[PDB]
Structures are given as C-alpha cells and as structure tokens.
Amino acid sequence: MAKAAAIGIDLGTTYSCVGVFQHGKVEIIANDQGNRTTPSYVAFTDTERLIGDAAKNQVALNPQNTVFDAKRLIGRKFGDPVVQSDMKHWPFQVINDGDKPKVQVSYKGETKAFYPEEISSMVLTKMKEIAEAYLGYPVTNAVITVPAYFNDSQRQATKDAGVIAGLNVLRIINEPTAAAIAYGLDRTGKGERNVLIFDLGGGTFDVSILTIDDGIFEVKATAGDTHLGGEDFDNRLVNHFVEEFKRKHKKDISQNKRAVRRLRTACERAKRTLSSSTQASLEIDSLFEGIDFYTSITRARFEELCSDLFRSTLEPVEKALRDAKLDKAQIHDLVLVGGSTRIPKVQKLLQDFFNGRDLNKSINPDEAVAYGAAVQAAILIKSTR
Ligand SMILES: Nc1ncnc2c1nc(Cl)n2[C@@H]1O[C@H](CO)[C@@H](O)[C@H]1O
Incomplete structure (x- = not known):
C-alpha cells in the first residue's frame, strides 16, 4: 500500500514539484490551489506559518519574515x-x-x-502533504533532486531536510539525470549517449552535459549562471513599462513599492502569454495616483528587451562543450528544463546554435525533473520490495 509507494520531488530554488509513477504513467500532482508547481517560500506571520502559494502571495506585506x-x-x-x-x-x-x-x-x-x-x-513537508491528499494515504518514500554541481555537504543537508520532513530518502539524484530519465534517454540500449540539459528556471541557469553508457550516468560538465533566470526577464518588462508610464503621464512610479510589485506580477503573467501569443495585454486598475494602466506589448518588443540576456545563455553552452571536450555534432540529445525554456526566442537560439536540431520539450519543462525523480522513485521502491 503506502510502503510500496514512492514520490519524486524536485526541490527547486524558486518552485518545487512532486510526482508519482503509478499505473504506467507519471502524475504531476496539483496542490490545493490546482497548481502543478509550488513556490519554495515559507512565511512566518503573527498567527501562522505559510508554505507555497499562500506564502508567495503575502511577500509584499511581510518581506522580513518571508523566506x-x-x-x-x-x-x-x-x-x-x-x-x-x-x-x-x-x-x-x-x-x-x-x-x-x-x-x-x-x-x-x-x-x-x-x-x-x-x-x-x-517546503518538503508541503510536497509530501500534496502527494498524500492526491493518493488518499501517507507516502513517505521519496527521491529528492539536487543540481549536478552540489557537493557532499549540500547533498547531505538536502537528505537531512527530507528526514526532518518525515520522508525516507531513497536517493538524492542530480536534476539533469532526472530530466534524462524523464525522456527515457538511459533506455536506448548499448553505446555512449551524450545529453545536454538546458535548464533555465526562475532565478538560475544551468547547463549540464551527461554521458549515458549502458544505463550508467556520468556528469561530463556543468556550466551556467546562478543569478540568471525568468525573474530577470520580468524586471526588463518592468523597466519598459515604468518608462512608458513616464512617457504617457510624466510621472515616475519606480519609488511606489506597491505600483512596482503590481506591475511586476502583471509583467510575469504577460511574459507567459508571450510564449503562445504574439502580443499580451496589461490591465492594471489604478496603478499610480488613480491612473489605470491598460496597455500591450508584442513578443518582438519583449525579445528586444531581453535580447542580451537570451544571447548570454549560449556562452555556458559553449563553455560546457569545451569542458566536456565535445563538439556540437557529438551531442545526441538536447533536453529543456525550467519554465523559461518555453520562451520561443530561447528555443530558437538553442536550436540554431545546435544547427537546426530538434529539442526534447514535450514534457512540461518546469515538471520534467519531478517526472524523472518519480520514475526513479518507482524503480527504487520496487527493487526494495
Ligand atoms: N509560459 C511561460 N513562458 C515563459 N516563462 C515561463 C512560462 N511558464 C513559466 Cl513557469 N515560466 C517562468 O518559468 C520560471 C519558473 O521555472 C518563472 O520565471 C516563470 O515565470
């Protein structure tokens, strides 16, 4: 029952995700607000401790006590x-x-x-309770993921977080390894398979190169930028709209903390729309001094606003290839991880860099890591019996 069940948890920097492998398929489990990913936020208030969406939702009102x-x-x-x-x-x-x-x-x-x-x-206790509400029984066996560059101390402290949360940690696996498992890239038979994982999340960018030799994973290279992610793109949209408000109304809103935060969340939403539409509309009632801010932006302008940042994602790709001592044509598979990889310009830049190559992107990129962890947790709990 519960003892033969195991979950996979992607414990992310900005968001976490939980999955379960049952009846031949992975189910990415939605939280109590229907979200398939949960913010890695913990708020301490005058009455309670909040975790996830509720914690992220009150960050403006309580920033000193929102971790x-x-x-x-x-x-x-x-x-x-x-x-x-x-x-x-x-x-x-x-x-x-x-x-x-x-x-x-x-x-x-x-x-x-x-x-x-x-x-x-x-954060882990919340993911555990999200899985329990879905399954109808407590599940305690889990696979938790970590970046491929985490050392022994970081891996041990993550396992310790799992124990404190009441989870039996079956294994601590690398995030790019879980993503490669999600796509079944370890089950292609014999011969060395070179995989590049391009992981662009909310606050970090990681490039990993793995070699899969007869089911055995080897990390050849890790590169990236620990301070580059989706939130830098939200901030580029914010500066544009602050300048547009100044041009239309001759008023600087940058000092009004509430105006900037409402603009920031609206920009994040518009950015997501820009991944599947060529324009997005901002509809902010009384943004500053009673002035409504009803405007729009094309995908072409958003691409211009982040152009330098999108292009900068290719330097760690080249760096990882040189560290791994592999040329582009020696990479068998390209895997997308992180919500920001849904951005069409990012996909186009990566595909063109790899000379028109297809990308592995059919699994929700913000869910691929939990998906793989869930597959591994099922294999590991079955071997434990
Ligand atoms: N449709 C999307 N188009 C662009 N960015 C997206 C999209 N979905 C998410 Cl999540 N993100 C971003 O991914 C990060 C979390 O992994 C956040 O920055 C989120 O905005």
Missing part, C-alpha cells in the same frame, strides 16, 4: 563568499551560528531562527 532561496544557503558555511554576497540581496535576516547560517524571523510575536535544512524541510 525564499534557502537552496542558495543549504549545506554552506556562513563565511562562504556565495552566502556573504547573497545576504546583501535578501530582506530576511541571516545570522551566524558557529559558522552555520540560520535565517532569523519573527513568528507569532517571537524571534526564531532556522537552519536552511529546516526551511527546506517545511
């Missing part, structure tokens, strides 16, 4: 220059507990501090 990006801290020492650099950009406090970072917040009127693995365990 996100715990994955950037997990398994790291406080003195790590990655931690010291990131801390300057977060509205929540990060403290030092014997060279270990803790996020410090106000919860039910009291000061509380949490280890990154404790924050990530709250």
Whole structure:
C-alpha cells in the first residue's frame, strides 16, 4: 500500500514539484490551489506559518519574515563568499551560528531562527502533504533532486531536510539525470549517449552535459549562471513599462513599492502569454495616483528587451562543450528544463546554435525533473520490495 509507494520531488530554488509513477504513467500532482508547481517560500506571520502559494502571495506585506532561496544557503558555511554576497540581496535576516547560517524571523510575536535544512524541510513537508491528499494515504518514500554541481555537504543537508520532513530518502539524484530519465534517454540500449540539459528556471541557469553508457550516468560538465533566470526577464518588462508610464503621464512610479510589485506580477503573467501569443495585454486598475494602466506589448518588443540576456545563455553552452571536450555534432540529445525554456526566442537560439536540431520539450519543462525523480522513485521502491 503506502510502503510500496514512492514520490519524486524536485526541490527547486524558486518552485518545487512532486510526482508519482503509478499505473504506467507519471502524475504531476496539483496542490490545493490546482497548481502543478509550488513556490519554495515559507512565511512566518503573527498567527501562522505559510508554505507555497499562500506564502508567495503575502511577500509584499511581510518581506522580513518571508523566506525564499534557502537552496542558495543549504549545506554552506556562513563565511562562504556565495552566502556573504547573497545576504546583501535578501530582506530576511541571516545570522551566524558557529559558522552555520540560520535565517532569523519573527513568528507569532517571537524571534526564531532556522537552519536552511529546516526551511527546506517545511517546503518538503508541503510536497509530501500534496502527494498524500492526491493518493488518499501517507507516502513517505521519496527521491529528492539536487543540481549536478552540489557537493557532499549540500547533498547531505538536502537528505537531512527530507528526514526532518518525515520522508525516507531513497536517493538524492542530480536534476539533469532526472530530466534524462524523464525522456527515457538511459533506455536506448548499448553505446555512449551524450545529453545536454538546458535548464533555465526562475532565478538560475544551468547547463549540464551527461554521458549515458549502458544505463550508467556520468556528469561530463556543468556550466551556467546562478543569478540568471525568468525573474530577470520580468524586471526588463518592468523597466519598459515604468518608462512608458513616464512617457504617457510624466510621472515616475519606480519609488511606489506597491505600483512596482503590481506591475511586476502583471509583467510575469504577460511574459507567459508571450510564449503562445504574439502580443499580451496589461490591465492594471489604478496603478499610480488613480491612473489605470491598460496597455500591450508584442513578443518582438519583449525579445528586444531581453535580447542580451537570451544571447548570454549560449556562452555556458559553449563553455560546457569545451569542458566536456565535445563538439556540437557529438551531442545526441538536447533536453529543456525550467519554465523559461518555453520562451520561443530561447528555443530558437538553442536550436540554431545546435544547427537546426530538434529539442526534447514535450514534457512540461518546469515538471520534467519531478517526472524523472518519480520514475526513479518507482524503480527504487520496487527493487526494495
Ligand atoms: N509560459 C511561460 N513562458 C515563459 N516563462 C515561463 C512560462 N511558464 C513559466 Cl513557469 N515560466 C517562468 O518559468 C520560471 C519558473 O521555472 C518563472 O520565471 C516563470 O515565470
């Protein structure tokens, strides 16, 4: 029953996703708001702890006590220059507990501090409860994914987050490996198969090259930009619309925190529409000083606004190929991961770089990792019996 069942969890930097492999198919499980992915956010309020959508939905009202990006801290020492650099950009406090970072917040009127693995365990507990509500019984066996570049300390702290969350961690697997499993790229028989995973998420960009030799995965190269993602594209749209508001009304809105946030969420929505329509409409009632902001933007203008950022995704692709010592024609498969890979210009740039090659994109790119983890969790629990 429950003991013969296992889930696959993609514990992402900005969003998490849970899947289950049963009756010959993967089911990506929708949360209680009907969303197939859940924000990796934890909010501490005057009455409760919120996780996911409810936590992301109140971030503007409570920024000091809304934790996100715990994955950037997990398994790291406080003195790590990655931690010291990131801390300057977060509205929540990060403290030092014997060279270990803790996020410090106000919860039910009291000061509380949490280890990154404790924050990530709250996200994991939510994914576990989302699976349980779908299945009708508690599932505790899980495969959790991590970036291919995570070291032993980061992998161990992720497993620790799983244990705190009440999960039996069957295995910690690499995100690009789970994506290759999702597409069945490890079941092509004999011979070395070279796979490139192009993973453009909400806040990070990862390029991974894997060799699959008779079911055995080997990481040949990892490249990317830990501070490049979908939110930089939302921000480029924001600056455009702030300048358009100034041209139409002779008013600078950039200082009004509420106006900028409402514009930001509307820009994120319009960006998604631009992946399947050649125009998107913004409809903001009373954006600033009672002025409605009803406008539109073409996909051509959005592509211009992010042109330099889209083009920059090809430098880590070339870097990974040189590190792996492979030419473009030596790569057998190209896999898309992350919601931002739905952007047509991004697909076109990658396909043209690989000389007109087909891309593996039929599985929802923001779900491909959880899909593969779910497949592996099923194989692993069946072998355990
Ligand atoms: N249809 C889409 N077109 C463009 N960007 C998209 C799309 N869907 C998502 Cl999710 N994202 C973005 O992916 C990230 C999460 O993986 C977020 O930045 C989200 O906006």
